[model samples]
Target chain A: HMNPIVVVHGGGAGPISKDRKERVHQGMVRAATVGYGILREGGSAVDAVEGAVVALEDDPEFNAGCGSVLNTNGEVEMDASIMDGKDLSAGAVSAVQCIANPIKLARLVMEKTPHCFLTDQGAAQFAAAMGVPEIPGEKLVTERNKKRLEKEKHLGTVGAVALDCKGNVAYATSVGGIVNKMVGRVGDSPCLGAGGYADNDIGAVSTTGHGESILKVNLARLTLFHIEQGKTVEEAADLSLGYMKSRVKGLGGLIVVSKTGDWVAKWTSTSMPWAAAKDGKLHFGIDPDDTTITDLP
Target chain B: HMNPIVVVHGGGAGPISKDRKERVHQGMVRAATVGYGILREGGSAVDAVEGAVVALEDDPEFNAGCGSVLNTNGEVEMDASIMDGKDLSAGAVSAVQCIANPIKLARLVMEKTPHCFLTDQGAAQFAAAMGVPEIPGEKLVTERNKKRLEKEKHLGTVGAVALDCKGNVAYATSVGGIVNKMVGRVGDSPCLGAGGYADNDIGAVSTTGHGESILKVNLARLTLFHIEQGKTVEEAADLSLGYMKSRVKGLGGLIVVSKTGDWVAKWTSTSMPWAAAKDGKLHFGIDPDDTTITDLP
Candidate 1:
């Protein structure tokens, strides 16, 4: 089908300072570069999206892997998920400790295990058996994350979506969650249909929000359903995020990519979300605030 | 009508190691000591319970005060409320950035301002004018809190209820919230008659759960309404907690004290709640498992 691959990133409320913004811009650029590299190498859409997300996940300034929020116990029990649109397969994990990149492990689960999600000791055990690198829980920690934990910040999740040349699509999302969550608590980021989903026949989606609220609305699935109902990619994404805001006072955000290669990113909070597309273009914007997506392709 | 005072603690099922359990135990005991001290000094029941909760709020090991969860911008935003049963006067603050003891400020608000709550920069300015101690955000940080922050824990609130010699009742609650919350994001903790409330005419009640659910159910008010409708304190608390569990798959806990001095506490989800009563008795129990209230006087 030769769908023009499109890459989209979710970064909420760009860094407060110019230097921090520059670092975030670099991280976004690197993510787009990775996506482009995977696509150039003829990688699957899933692989391309995953690679890009991994690049962002490794960044110490964003609110994902290295810069996630600390839990109530002051540890980073990260959550992540990945979905392949080709067959609608999904894998996820919540409250995972001692794993640096949970998205990679989630992909492994999707490709290997019959289960759709894992958590706590079971998830960790599964990762170890899969020969996935096991990093110290602290390895995922960053100065920004520590500061958020120290200050009790409410940083949200990070996510990505991609449409490949073959018309296949994929999505991945990750988060440290609201700092100091009660022990063993998990968020929507790794809860499959809640925070992430994809269907080559329809679209791919990922979410960010008060995890509980996202779970309540089944965010990712809702977006895909909207797309199935013939809504444009942007309409589906906006509808899902808007529905969530109407139901709860808490805020949320999302990114979506339709099988046809249309891309949409939206958020219903005061913070802005960052994005980068396949045309080697990077942009930042806020939803429900600044209706215009500035510096776009 | 000297109904025995009861104390409950959080009992989450996640990775709460034996050592962590002991630390949580120590925190509850410390809080109980504060309550007992106030009671022994012939303070009103409201004072006793609020004092205990205040101690926990100040304790570094607990979620309130110095160990509170951070906001989206990596800053502490404290919330607290106090309701006097005799007058139904309620005072609260949301998105507070610099006050150490929000409960004390809440009490002051009850006595001074006509408002029920203040938020964000306004709340902080009010507390400063009241001469409440204002520490640099760093001063409030603690190792345990830091550890939870590092882990992105969401456990960050302290609450209490008391019955005085005069048979008057009062409720007090405080929370730092999950770290990295959007700026100005306020949870149920500061919403009067939602997260917490007290009434000498009916009963005293405090709640812990998903803020959205609590707001939807107006849980604290519902608990009192049930008691007023002729339900036992336990019945009222259980019914309200049940309503929450049914409406949303949210985990929650509640404590109640009737005018007759009866006490009741209930929780849905894992063991995120515990209690200690008068007469040197203590009991710890979790949810979807052991539903018993241990160590009753």
Candidate 2:
């Protein structure tokens, strides 16, 4: 049996208020715990990552489903994607409005449709057909995001990656997008190989940062390519992120898990709330400088 | 002066009606002529590629712009993208309706917006902001495509790539998408690095085939990576297309131009209508087995 590991993150590559860091860390831990519990129970890696991302999407502090920031029109348009490494099957939804749990909907897209991507009204149409209930678009907007839309020195996103006992690997990512972005703007969150990628032969990756920059580098897949070239997951993520920074002048971070269960959470930002569960222990951090670990029950 | 080359294709990796072959070849030639003409005038590679793609988009005989196919809803939703190699800047629009010349709008998005992608109504909104005129969606539908919507043994997309005197590279792609595809289904066309990619350090690629398969492999960028790894333009495209075929069981084709002006038009289909203009001459072919060259005026 392969060792199982689960990793989750709250968006960063930006400043976290000193007062908010602990809460962000708490959210990461809770998400990691939820995903690890699934793996401990022998759930598939796809399920583990999706479950962890859904947790972040629901968290009011994260820029994913509910707490997602507004577009220039003061509307909530979300992007999400999920990749199953076993066969490289994937699904994504972008510029969607009035959808809760975009990650769940992304999975539905993968399972229910013949296509890998759906957008805006088209995605809404798919959501309707899939029995994925819709909420009022306005309902997803929060006051904090509304105010934050007026600012941004940080990128906002959430993601998860996992290696399952069955030896499967998977990754999922969701975003509300950059604050006050152009209407219908889609960040890397919904772009295959940019936002996330998985392959049972290599590993899985989920990226957060400047979307355009990420797309230019095709970050997630690039990371996996480095691993294929014999770099460890940590070395791969570092090289890939460094390329994006140096070549494209883009800032970002990522979480990755090798096919054999080794994992790493890396970012080019000041802080990123990241957590991982392995061998009945939880490891996590926010400040770029340090980490902490706790034994699980 | 370095040699300048412009390549254009009328999509394939599938069947083309023998009767329609001449017309498709004509369209590809016209687009190549337009782009080559621009490059001959010392135009930027970005402008030359965009000019070529715009010609194809305007040619109703091809599956872009005015002659696009319908979705499941019996409406035209187009996708397009443009990339400039010098800075890796890109713009894309997907699931857009009522827009003629999505490729042009995609260029505008690259120039005017900070974001790399926009879809559906948001793209329309950007179109509005950019003062791009919107035609009725019905204006783009043709009886030929309406009938074709009921069938397919080939992927449909049109694209161009160019290397100009200044040693710059660029690529553009436009698609009406598969016939009767799900509403809001976005193919690789507007995904960036999948449909098309450009980098002055390596090369540029524009892909046509199974969009899902293309996205899974990140075909355009992958082709360039092979080039960066020392593969010739021909070898790189062949390797990339071969990988898509063997690994994903997907058939596709691509046109590539290396930074030093070497170029290739290769496909894994029975036929692809491709034409190129280099060194004051036009080379074109519709049959997989032969190519024809003519001296230009």
Candidate 3:
């Protein structure tokens, strides 16, 4: 059942204008397709997932890196995580600043360092130790973003999951927490088994939503539990989101996939932009129903 | 099936001396007894586990609170977590300084705040906002401890698992990571589904040893998975520890308890101090042959 396929979800954002949805959709496509391409080229799933996230991090439309939301300090402190399902190796960073692409740093933590998760000063220190080359003042928060933050106008994270050539699965996620967050508060983005989790022989998951609520229920692991118990990918995601909705009463969503990359994504928020690519064809969506299963390049 | 029982593990210390082992055992018994006493009085599992951790944190022999280890910056930085199996509510903190009792702050994060985890300066901010009066200079560090830090002479964590009168289970742990560790390097103690995890209707777990390896395998959750598949508490713990050993090839341990109060404490290291209380009596230990299961107090 090992097949090369990729699934990606842009952060579930507000029901912004149609033009905005189109732009977000483009980011998802750009990331997932790149990931999909890597897999088709017989590349490592780890590389596929990493390549996918790097594209997302550079996009100003996503809730990470360049256009990340501001905290109460009115600045950006990003959080991210990456999981290599093959070895169950993981690296996550929280309250990271100065690094433009935290997902890349997360991978470094996995490949170069001996630790699984690092936060704030520790992460920064590791970044230097591993020659991460984080550029200070490389990005800035504009007054316009501060105003948008005051009203909580935007929200979204970028993520990818894939089944590569060697039957390995890999997953990654990055996010800027909600607008005006605490000085050092963290979200599920950097919480393993909370926002991101994977089982090499079985499946992988990436989540976005209310970070606090997602961590409370351990969204990623919860969905994996269901899949292990014989539920299909879609069924597991549906139940996991349903349970979360009943308890958290806030927006949340997840993109899930099996070893062969059959996938499903569910968003409890107003709308989530998502897309998938397999054999060079794409299937994208804003609403679960209105979108067709296959929309390609 | 609710039965009153308590299981506690002192930090799995390095190969230390007789006098040191004696002191550590005393702390474990004293703390475990406190938790046992709470269960005997028909207290909630949440309260019992919290009580157990507080005693260990206050004791100078363990790697927690008053007597904890120092970071690379030559100051105390702590991490801790608590989980209530009854409602699946949990709280954790990482790289926290100035909070004498990180476990108490962890519980506050669980009970008082709407969030699940807090870190660094933000945890300190919330501590003040929540009326947690932590006296900074009150924390003690002896010159001998400073010397001990140089040779990396210590390694251990304090943890407890309890089944209370109301058919609920709870788990909690605290730690000072390896001495001279990075300013924000996090061991597994504060990580969910890695160092600590619990399920109300199933069981609970807390782990020690290498954080990197532990997080790599999701040790806490993996044991719960076996139990979810219907393994007994002892069986599940054994299988989990065995798996960790085969893969990690290192010193690691786990203290486990089922919802019904059956328990096990297993460690790969040569010696680990542990204590348990059931049937209104305490059974404590420091070595395999030395600690008879009959030291009732």
Candidate 4:
């Protein structure tokens, strides 16, 4: 029988300091806990996933909200998306600034508007209309990211996926984007079916990676396609990631949760900090070959 | 047996003035002719489609570029996308304003940048860096659209698809978006695999209609998926459009050209101004059950 499940990811594994990776792992754990708690408490899958992504967005350890990387102009431009499988209702924001939690705003777009996406100044305007208070753009930048922008950057995003007791699934993804990128660059994070997708009849997916490569392959949708073609969740994840690597030379990671509750956390990069909760058990990993499982009572 | 072909669309048919409908048909024909001329002269599929969309964008009769509809703020925010099937390269811009031709800018993004999408102010900034001059935003608002905004607005988009002699396929779509929509609303026009998708192995597609509905089903990619599953181009277009209707109640139109030159111009709306050119022949239609075929010589 299918049970409620929640999954979260910090982002692509980087060659950053060990302490940095530790913090990323902690953030993933915290996000998974938050989301899993929602599901355990009988929350909707959409709410669970949104809660998870919001946790990641708030954590300074991740390259999402407060820790987002800088663009060429040294400003924080973020992208986020969320989708509810119950009705295929989705919302996304791209190239937005000063939004502390883009995932929350994205969810608002889905629930409050008939449109599926908003961008830049328009997104900011919608945020205002919805009463999502704007923070100072400078408040979103972190010292670590500021330094990275001076020298280099991180290819990281934060995301979540969940399957609720009602068998509905949902997905959310958010990113600060690569450091020192072009000013108006909108990555895969906010693109429907590229960064994330959800369909109760099929499944749900959330992705993290090189945004361009993910957009080209429509990574989230591609994985679900494999599943729709009768491949197992694990097999579909592998095949999709494999195809992306071969077709676009793109590295990435994804979380998939079928309507039946089968799930997969897979990646092609060196590391992806991910966590999952099912049947009162918690599982997590940071490296390609590292997974630790524990009982949560 | 496969030859070059070009297809262009003005937008969804509306209960507008008879003069307006005629001008829309003329614009579609002109666009098809321009694109077909490129293919006939052995130009690349990417060039043909881009040129065709540019023609549509330049025409004030269509709801793109100069004739784009106003948003709730009474401002013009445009969206556009271009895709190259041969290499799976794509570029798009959303919620952009004060630009003369968003399609050209989209093409430049595909040709000049390492990224696939840009948005809002960042896109405008990139426009300046790329030498695309910015005009007054007010210039993009036509008197016809102003009147419509005063009352209501049009649901229209301009798009093109082309298959070249090199066995390559390309697609482009542009829109001013729905009239009086919320500020910053982005529809399917700039979302890859939603507004349009291209694959040298399968076909190319360009879509126009309710942007949100298109985004929900990822219409362009959904059509190509049908084709990839062995359906003929015509059957695929019908099935895909049918699914959107049943799934999301979306009324839209699409132009599809297979890698082998098979083509379909299908829609669920009451009317769509569409034209196609192949082998020195032109085919055009504006209403259901109405198609005029002519030898272009």
Candidate 5:
């Protein structure tokens, strides 16, 4: 079995960033550190991945959590999902504005409810009933930053996938979605198997980019299927991304990891920033355009 | 290739009356017959499936379109999706109440926008912008029937799968979801490879039942993947459902059809109703409990 590892994305994240790239890189480094620490402490795969992503959610350099972009009406709506590969159970929240930690809410939905997904006011109500914390509007990014954030300045999403010592696996994804996206529009971010999916039978996968096409072709699930059929994680990721490029013209990145700790990062855009942590060392890479292959980082 | 065919269901349609079951059966018969007629007329599989489902959507006896149940707010919120196997294109809408045909809007989303899914206000706006017709709330269900909509009455949804003379396959599904479901709660009905999935290279699938569990294992995609891995359509469907039962304890029904027009259905409920149309003839069947193993009608 491979060393327990975790992966993350969002500093100059593209064929894709200049300052954004730098920020994404730094955030990812911190996340990988946090995630690896969790794993190092014998955390479950879910804990390692979730803790890693929670750091990114706190960073404005990434388009999740506090830095999530506003919808058309300039209201913040966050979506997140977490899947436990061991059991294949999942939970998610969408069109949520109040939760400070949407990932926790997503996990709660998974652990607490018979329902697998929740959204909008219904989720908020459940969160309130369950005592999930709410954020004050006063804490939002300033009016200026929020306005400036209305443009698609970044392909904003953060995700993590991990394999733990117990051989358990997990995938977690969070997004503020695209800036100025339509209100009441639920992107593929909160979708199971499309945005995020996991299976101890094969692996775990979390996706970023063109939520539309990512979902239409069933990205994460397709990749894991190829893996189950004996394709290497890299080969499975490539085939999946190739389908995205050819079929849906998909443009985004995905983080994938198998139970044995096999991992791969694949993308369509040039600037998909990613960090690969294996054994005791960590490395980072980004492909500009589609030519350069990202080294295992 | 096998003769062109279509299959549909409203099985496990709830603990309802014999008249309701009979009515669901008649509605499915009409849909399968219409879809078969379309295939006989050289229509595309997508057209056949869509036309058949549209008729189902219009019928008040089923839990789709006009008959969709109310949410916690006592308002009908519908979800539906459609996928084209040849091109691998898809469209979906969720939590929309006004549309006369939610599936048509889903088809429109596939053809009109770069987006694959739309929900709530965005979907309603698109419905208006695309010139889709709307029905007033009062007409959706009468005052007396509103209580029926409010009750946690049934776990019902409607779905269809089709194969045309051209060897193309298509899948479509629509549901009002659980009665009095929390608003903003979405089920597998709007999920691409859970509630619906298709591949001309293999098969197409649409499901009804515990949406959460179906999505957890990425059911339809996994089913189609098994076919890609050399399993026959029937074997793949059985393995997929059995996995759901054992792994996720899934409780639902699925209708699957391969590109060659070979089809099968599996359900965990006792009283799930189904209709199948092949060549020029149609058939219908159902069982009464979890012990029921519904054969293709």
Candidate 6:
């Protein structure tokens, strides 16, 4: 049997390791452990990835699901997307309200709809029709998110990726764009092929950054193309980010999980991005002096 | 007649001409005209100004009342304060929900409560008890505002000021403050002597800009102080805007209507603020050009 593996992690403003600078690394390890445990118990890779991502989303410091930015109107309108690389199918929603876990909704949309995205009232209706429980707006919010909404109001996004033993890969992302935005505004997070995309033949990838810039770059598709053309995981990640920088996109980062179990993460901003990976080992880093990934034992 | 005195208009979205540049500006003009007509009909400055401002509060484009931004948890929470220089009394509500016209409620609070501000669910209850209509959220929103909420959700904040026929003065302002902001993210707009203030003893003034910088500058109070200390209306306006620019506060602007019918407007951003005086005269200019005021006749 293929070695059952799980990877889980998130990044943004959480506690960073001063010595090893491996908060992301450790988080990845924890996520992988969760995946490993689920897989060991005979859970599907989809379930394992979802569990890992939900763990990161629950963390107040990470830039995903719960910790997304508040919109211009001072409300939490989250965007999320999910893909099933085995069928090359995808689902997404932008500026959804009342749903706590947008990824779950995206997953359902992928299973249910011929379309890829939905927004605002329609997204909520879709969630209801799918029987996804709608939580009170308060439940989806966190104290940290509340404080950030009060303070920064906008500025962050989150995402996840997975490759199953069957070679199927999937990717997802969520965000609250830079805060104090105009009401009803949607971002690239739910714009398929922009903030996220997946292809079983190549890999699954997701992005976090200035929504407008990401949309302009079509960064996710660029990364997928590079990988399909035989570039190494690291090379694909570098090329995608380099292309964005050359075009002057706003600040942020990305993560890619290839079918070969080769994962690459990168960010370009004045500050460092949070990151981690797991393969029976934990690794995390924030603005390390070295960009190279050291192998886990 | 009253010489068709210039009716200077002020609100969100800078004006480079008498013509409205934004829906909020159009709302301000509509309300300002109401006040001007009231004044033309021999109403006291208090009644005319109040009438016009209340009309604006009713209009959905401006942020004062119905069209205010919702809080982080998806509730319509507004901040508004009104000061009548004739009595030196003021009333305000910060983070209020359900009340359609916050400015009217503020006026009532000043007339009834010996207090400054009320908030959350309580403010709505008080407004209801005072016989103010509890309009539905749908009624409070306009198609223009709805489109704006989706298009330019970043531009927010609305206000009004008037110099009565007897030289009595009053000022009021309100905003949603970066849509989807935290439930209680009050800005300078509701802070007494900050976003809204008037002193007939000197000259009435209302300010708009980055709330943080405005608070730090003690904007409205400082402008009044300067005018009271024998500074020209132009001087006070120039100093406040100059200080804002010096401080490196992000893009913002302001409008000042002094007791002598002298109107002053300024901004640090690329756009000019909208202002029109009762005499049918108007002044509007965008960046790259100096201030320009034209007599209507």
Chain B TM-score of predicted candidate 6 relative to the true chain B: 0.82
Query: Please, what is the whole-model Cα lDDT of each candidate in the order they appear?
Result: 0.67, 0.88, 0.80, 0.88, 0.78, 0.60
lDDT of 2 by residue, B1-297 (tens): 678899998777567777888788888889999999999889999999899889988888888998987787678989999999999999999988888899999999899988888899989988998888879876798888777765542437899999999889999999987787899998999987799999999989999988999998889988988887889988998999998887788878999998888988998877788999998789998767688989876
Winner on lDDT between 3 and 5 is 3
Worst 10 residues of 5 chain B by lDDT: B288-297
Higher-lDDT candidate among 2 and 5? 2
Model 4, A1-297: lDDT tens per residue? Answer: 358999898676555568776777788888988988998887999899999988988888888889889898989989999998977899999888998999999999999888889888889988988999888787898787778787774448889999898888999999999889988898888888899989999999999888899899888988998999999999999999998899889998999988888898999887788999998899988886679899876
Alpha-carbon runs more than 4 Å astray in model 2:
A150-155, B150-155
Can you tell me the CAPRI class of model 6?
incorrect
Candidate 2 residue lDDT tens string, A1-297: 888999998775667787787888778888989998999897999999999999998888888999888888878889999998987899999988887899999999898889999999989888998888888787798877767667653437899999998899999999999787778988899998899999898999999888899998899999988998899988998999999999989988999999888889999977778999999998989877689888988
Q: Which stretches of candidate 3 lie over 4 Å from their true place?
A: A1-3, A13-16, A133-138, A142-144, A152-154, A246-251, A293-297, B13-16, B131-144, B152-154, B288-291, B294-297
lDDT for model 5, please.
Answer: 0.78
Shift of residue B121 alpha carbon in model 3, Å: 1.8
Q: By descending lDDT, how would the candidates be arranged?
A: 2, 4, 3, 5, 1, 6
Report the lDDT tens digits of candidate 5 across residue range A126-203: 898789788874354545447676554455678899998888889888887666676666777788988878888788
Better of 1 and 2 by TM-score: 2
Candidate 3, residues A53-91, lDDT tens digits: the string is: 888888888788777888777778888999988878888
lDDT of 3 by residue, B1-297 (tens): 466888888766467687787787778888888998888788888788889889988887787887777767667888899998866788899888777789889998898877778888778889999877776633645454466676664457888989887778889999866677767877788777778887776788988877777776677887888888889877887787787777666567788888767788877776677888888667777555565465455
TM-score of chain A of each: 0.89, 0.97, 0.94, 0.97, 0.91, 0.83
Ranking by TM-score: 4, 2, 3, 5, 1, 6
Supply candidate 4's per-residue lDDT for B48.
91
DockQ of structure 2: 0.80
Give model 6's share of reference contacts: 0.00
Best-to-worst DockQ order: 4, 2, 5, 3, 1, 6
Q: How do the candidates score on chain B by TM-score?
A: 0.88, 0.96, 0.93, 0.96, 0.91, 0.82
What is the DockQ for all candidates, taken in turn? Answer: 0.02, 0.80, 0.56, 0.84, 0.57, 0.01
